[PDB]
C-alpha cells in the first residue's frame, strides 16, 4: 500500500509501558488505518520514540533520528522544555510539529511550523473570566500549580485592571501533595470563591484535603480550570452543596463521540489507575482525546494533499522539507469535527482559539 509514516515522541509514564498519550496515539492510528473513509489509499505507519521526562537534549536527538527515519509530522511531547526543543528542531527542518498539551509559549518565538491543540489558555481564561463576571464575584483567589507559571493565567491577572475584582493569588506547594496550611490560610482569610489551576490529579488531591479541612460547604465555590472536571469523582462531595463548576471540552453528549469513549474504556486500553486516589475510572482524559484528534486532523490534511511523499531529512545540517510548507498551510487550514468539538485553528499563530466549551457544574446528581 501507499506508505505514510507519522512520528511521535512520548514520555516515560511508568503506570505501564505506554502512557495514556501514546495509547491514544497508537489506538487512533489503528482506527484511521481501519476506517476506509479517512485515507483509504494510504496507510499511516508510525515511528514512536519514547524519551525520559525533562530531557530537551534526548528529545532533540530522538527527533533528529525520527526525521532521519523520514517522517511526515511529529506528535508530542507534552512537557514544555522538551516540546520547545522539538518545536524548533521542526521549525528548522520544515516538518509539522503537532503539540497536544499546553506548552509555555515564548512570545518572541518566530516558529511558523507548529500547531497547538490544547485550547489556548488565553481564550480559556477569558471563559473563566466570563464565569467570574456571571457569578458576580469580587474576592477571587487564584490557586495555581507551580509546574507552570502565571503566564497562562495572564488574563485572570490582567482582569482587575479592567473590572471590579480583588484577586489574591496563592501558590500550591509543588514539592508535596498536602495543601493543608494553604487551605488553612485560605479558610482563615475568608477566601470563599476560589479558581483552581491544576491538573486533575492535583484537583482531586486538593478537593480531598479541602473536604477534610471542612471547606466544602454552601459558601465555597471552586471554579476549576482543568478540562477534566467530569473525570473527577464527586461522590463524597455531591451532597455538601459546594457549587464547584468548571469547563468540559469532550463531546460526551454526542453519540459518535461517546461510542469512542466506550471503545476506549471497554477493554482497559486505558491503564487501570488507583481507585483509592480520587479520580474516576474508565474514562478518556482530555490529553488522550486531544492526541486522538491530533492525528485525525493531520490525516485529513494528508487527504487534501495527494502527491506528498516522505523525504529523508538530515538533522543539524541541511535543507528544509520540500512539501512541508504547503503541508503546514494545509494543517492550519484544516477543519474537523472531533471529540474535542470542532477543530479549526487561529490561522495567524497556529494556536486553537475557536472551540465550544461546556460549562459543567456540580448539582446534587
Amino acid at each position: 500500500t501507499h506508505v505514510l509514516r507519522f512520528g511521535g515522541i512520548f514520555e516515560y509514564v511508568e503506570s505501564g509501558p505506554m502512557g495514556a498519550e501514546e495509547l491514544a496515539f497508537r489506538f487512533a492510528v489503528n482506527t484511521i488505518n481501519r476506517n476506509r473513509t479517512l485515507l483509504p489509499n494510504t496507510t499511516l505507519t508510525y515511528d514512536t520514540q519514547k524519551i525520559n521526562l525533562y530531557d530537551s537534549f534526548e528529545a532533540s536527538k530522538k527527533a533528529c533520528d525520527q526525521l532521519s527515519l523520514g517522517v511526515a509530522a511529529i506528535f508530542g511531547p507534552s512537557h514544555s522544555s522538551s516540546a520547545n526543543a522539538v518545536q524548533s528542531i521542526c521549525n528548522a527542518l520544515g516538518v509539522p510539529h503537532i503539540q497536544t498539551r499546553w506548552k509555555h509559549q515564548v512570545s518572541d518565538n518566530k516558529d511558523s511550523f507548529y500547531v497547538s491543540l490544547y485550547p489556548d489558555f488565553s481564550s480559556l481564561s477569558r471563559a473563566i473570566l466570563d464565569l467570574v463576571q456571571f457569578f458576580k464575584w469580587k474576592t477571587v483567589t487564584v490557586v495555581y500549580d507551580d509546574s507552570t507559571g502565571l503566564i497562562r493565567l495572564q488574563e485572570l491577572i490582567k482582569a482587575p485592571s479592567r473590572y471590579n475584582l480583588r484577586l489574591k493569588i496563592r501558590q500550591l506547594p509543588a514539592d508535596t501533595k498536602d495543601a493543608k496550611p494553604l487551605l488553612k490560610e485560605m479558610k482563615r482569610g475568608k477566601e470563599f470563591h476560589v479558581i483552581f489551576d491544576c491538573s486533575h490529579e492535583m484537583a482531586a488531591g486538593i478537593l480531598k484535603q479541602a473536604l477534610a479541612m471542612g471547606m466544602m460547604t454552601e459558601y465555597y465555590h471552586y471554579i476549576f480550570t482543568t478540562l477534566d472536571l467530569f473525570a473527577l469523582d464527586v461522590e463524597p462531595y455531591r451532597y455538601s452543596g459546594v457549587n464547584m463548576t468548571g469547563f468540559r471540552i469532550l463531546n460526551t453528549e454526542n453519540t459518535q463521540v461517546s461510542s469512542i469513549i466506550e471503545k476506549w474504556s471497554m477493554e482497559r486500553l486505558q491503564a487501570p489507575p488507583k481507585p483509592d486516589s480520587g479520580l474516576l475510572d474508565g474514562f478518556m482524559t482530555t490529553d488522550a482525546a486531544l492526541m486522538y484528534d491530533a492525528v485525525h486532523v493531520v490525516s485529513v490534511a494528508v487527504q487534501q494533499f495527494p502527491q506528498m511523499t516522505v523525504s529523508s531529512l538530515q538533522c543539524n545540517r541541511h535543507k528544509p522539507w520540500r512539501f512541508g510548507t504547503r503541508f503546514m498551510s494545509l494543517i492550519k487550514e484544516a477543519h474537523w469535527e472531533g471529540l474535542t468539538g470542532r477543530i479549526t485553528f487561529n490561522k495567524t499563530n497556529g494556536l486553537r482559539t475557536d472551540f465550544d466549551l461546556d460549562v459543567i457544574s456540580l448539582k446534587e446528581e
Binding site: 521526562l53 537534549f57 534526548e58 536527538k61 526543543a85 528542531i89 495572564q154 480583588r166 484577586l167 493569588i169
Partner: protein, 474 residues
C-alpha cells in the same frame, strides 16, 4: 593540563554591540597579564556567536563547542530559550553552565542544577521591588509588563500583593509597542507608583510617552526593574524632581572599572559612530565576572587535584569526569568584581550581593542607598530623598479684600488693598516666601457640593489649583 579553554556564547551584534567580545578579550588579557609562578595555565576563551535565538541553532553551536574540549560554558546573554538549551546540554554532559543572562524560562529542579547564575534571581529582584514598595508605605502601585514573561520574572512580587486596582494592578503593553492607552488608564485610575518591566528601549518608550503625557513630575514614582538600568539616558525626562528609581550592580570602586569603561568607550566609537557610548552593559560586566569565577574555581580545582579535559562528542554520552567537583568548587567561590560580590548559595543562585539603587538625576544618577541580598534596604546611604513661591487664591469681598483702581498691574502688588491684602503681605513677609495673588475662578466662596467635589474657591483649593487661599473663608 594543556591550558584552560572555555566557551562564550553571545547574543550581541558586531556593530554597536553590548560588547561581550571586548569584555572577554579584555578579561583574557587581564588574567594572562597576571604573572603567577610558575608560567601557569594560560587562559583562553573561545568566542562562539549565535545569530538568532533558536534552540536548534544553539544545539548546533553547543555540539561544536563540546568537542573543542571546553571546561565551562557561559552565555548566552539575552536569549532565554537558547540559554535553556545550553543549560540542559551542558547539564547532561556535566559541563558547568555560568548563566550571565536572566531567567525567563520556568526553572525546574528536575532539570539538574549544574548551572550557576551570576545574574540575580527573579525572586530576588521581585523581593527588592517589594521592599522598595514597603519603604514607600505600600502605595497603590501598577505594573506595566512589556511581555507576558514579566509575570514569570515578577512571580513573587505579584503573588505577594492583593491584585486589584488599589494595591497592584497589572497592565501589559500590546503588540503595538505604544504605551499611551495604559498610561492613560493609570492616570485616571488614580495610581502613582508605576513599576515598568521591560528592556531598555521599551522602558524608554514608556517613560518618554509618560513625559509626553504629563505623568513625570514629583507625584509619580517609577520603579524600573531593568537591571540594565544605568545605560539609559532620560535627557528631557530627567527633571528637577522626577522620581525615576532603578537598580544597578556595579561596585564602581573596583580598581579595573575606569579602564574597563574606557576600553569599552573607545571600542564603541571605533565599532560604530551611531550615538554616544551609553555606559557599560551589565551583560558585559557579568561576562567579565563570569570568566573570573571560572578561572578562580578551576585554579582551586587544579590546586587540589589534577583536572583532565577530553574532547566530548554530542552523539555519545561521555560525561565529563569532574562535573560535580567543579560544581562544588564553583558554588563555593567568592569574587569581588564588577557586579559587587560573587558568592553563590546552595542552589547555584547568587547571594551576599548588593544592589545599588539609583535615581535618575541631573546628569545621570545619584543613589538612594542599597538593597542587600538577605536583609532589608538602607534607603539613606547617600541621603534618603523623601525631601523632594506660591499661588495666592482669593475671593474679592469688600472690605476684607477690596480691589484697587484696576488700571495698573493689579496682580501681585496692585491686586487689592484692605485687611486681607496687608494680611497676606505681612504673613508671607514673615514666613519669607513670595506668592502671587489671583482672583478666584468662580466668584463665590463656594460650597462642598453634590457634583462629586466642592464649588468655587473650596474646589479651587481642593483641586490643587493654587497654593494658599488667603481671603475671608468662613
Amino acid at each position: 593540563l594543556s591550558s584552560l579553554r572555555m566557551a562564550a556564547i553571545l547574543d550581541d551584534q558586531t556593530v554597536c554591540g553590548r560588547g561581550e567580545r571586548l569584555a572577554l578579550a579584555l578579561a583574557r588579557e587581564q588574567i594572562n597579564g597576571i604573572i603567577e609562578v610558575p608560567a601557569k595555565a594560560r587562559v583562553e576563551v573561545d568566542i562562539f556567536e549565535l545569530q538568532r535565538d533558536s534552540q536548534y541553532e544553539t544545539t548546533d553551536t553547543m555540539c561544536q563547542i563540546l568537542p573543542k574540549g571546553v571546561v565551562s560554558v557561559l552565555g548566552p546573554s539575552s536569549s532565554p530559550a537558547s540559554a535553556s538549551t545550553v543549560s540542559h546540554i551542558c547539564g547532561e554532559k556535566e559541563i558547568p553552565h555560568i548563566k550571565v543572562g536572566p531567567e525567563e524560562t520556568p526553572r525546574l529542579q528536575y532539570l539538574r542544577f549544574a548551572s550557576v547564575s551570576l545574574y540575580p534571581s527573579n525572586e530576588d529582584v521581585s523581593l527588592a521591588v517589594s521592599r522598595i514598595l514597603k519603604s514607600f508605605n505600600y502605595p497603590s502601585a501598577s505594573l506595566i509588563c512589556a511581555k507576558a514573561e514579566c509575570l514569570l520574572r515578577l512571580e513573587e512580587l505579584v503573588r505577594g500583593f492583593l491584585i486589584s486596582k488599589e494595591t497592584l494592578s497589572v497592565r501589559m503593553l500590546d503588540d503595538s509597542r505604544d504605551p499611551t492607552p495604559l498610561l492613560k488608564e493609570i492616570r485616571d485610575d488614580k495610581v502613582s507608583t508605576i513599576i515598568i518591566d521591560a528592556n531598555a528601549s521599551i522602558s524608554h518608550l514608556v517613560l518618554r510617552k509618560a513625559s509626553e503625557l504629563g505623568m513625570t513630575s514629583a507625584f509619580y514614582k517609577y520603579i524600573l526593574t531593568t537591571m540594565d538600568f544605568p545605560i539609559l539616558h532620560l535627557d528631557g525626562i530627567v527633571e528637577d524632581s522626577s522620581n525615576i528609581l532603578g537598580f544597578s550592580m556595579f561596585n564602581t570602586s573596583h580598581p579595573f572599572y575606569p579602564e574597563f569603561v574606557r576600553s569599552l568607550n573607545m571600542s564603541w566609537r571605533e565599532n560604530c559612530e551611531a550615538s554616544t557610548y551609553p555606559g557599560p552593559a551589565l551583560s558585559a560586566a557579568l561576562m567579565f565576572d563570569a570568566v573570573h569565577v571560572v578561572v578562580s574555581a578551576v585554579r582551586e580545582l587544579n590546586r587540589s587535584q589534577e583536572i583532565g579535559v577530553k574532547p566530548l562528542a554530542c552523539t555519545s554520552a561521555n560525561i565529563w569526569p569532574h562535573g560535580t567537583s567543579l560544581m562544588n568548587y564553583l558554588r563555593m567561590v567568592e569574587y569581588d568584581g564588577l557586579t559587587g560580590r560573587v558568592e553563590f548559595n546552595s542552589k547555584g543562585q547568587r547571594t551576599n550581593y548588593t544592589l545599588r539603587i539609583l535615581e535618575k538625576s541631573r546628569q545621570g544618577h545619584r543613589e538612594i542607598g542599597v538593597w542587600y541580598s538577605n536583609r532589608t534596604l538602607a534607603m539613606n546611604a547617600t541621603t534618603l530623598d523623601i525631601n523632594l513661591t506660591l499661588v495666592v487664591t482669593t475671593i474679592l469681598e469688600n472690605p476684607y479684600v477690596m480691589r484697587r483702581p484696576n488700571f495698573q498691574a493689579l496682580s501681585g502688588n496692585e491686586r487689592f488693598e484692605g485687611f486681607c491684602v496687608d494680611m497676606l503681605r505681612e504673613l508671607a513677609e514673615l514666613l519669607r516666601f513670595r506668592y502671587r495673588l489671583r482672583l478666584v475662578e468662580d466668584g463665590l466662596y463656594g460650597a462642598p457640593e453634590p457634583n462629586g467635589s466642592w464649588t468655587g474657591m473650596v474646589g479651587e483649593l481642593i483641586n490643587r489649583k493654587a497654593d494658599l487661599a488667603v481671603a475671608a473663608f468662613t
